[PDB]
């Protein structure tokens, strides 16, 4: 719908698979039971990632008021 294709168009891109859903912990643990470091490295990277963006603030700029207060 976004890309502007009709369902039965052969030139429709098929870039995605049915597996791309919210698999559980265990389902991912078995998908990669050959690479356990890969699972463990998610927990590790999650710990490294700690952002605190600005919330609840305000920022006015100013104005050419001479030597006078903004108030005044």
């Amino acid at each position: 719908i976004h890309d502007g294709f009709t369902l039965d168009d052969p030139k429709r891109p098929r870039n995605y698979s049915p597996q791309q859903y919210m698999r559980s912990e265990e389902e991912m643990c078995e998908l990669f039971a050959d690479i356990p470091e890969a699972l463990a490295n998610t927990v590790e990277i999650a710990k490294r990632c700690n952002v605190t963006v600005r919330l609840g603030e305000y920022f006015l700029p100013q104005f050419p008021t001479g030597d006078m207060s903004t108030e005044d």
């Binding site: 919210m22 912990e25 991912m28 643990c29 699972l39 463990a40 998610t42 927990v43 990277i45 999650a46």
Partner: peptide
């Protein structure tokens, strides 16, 4: 206890 989170 959890060993996985979705990162993409």
């Amino acid at each position: 206890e959890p060993r996985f989170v979705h990162l993409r």
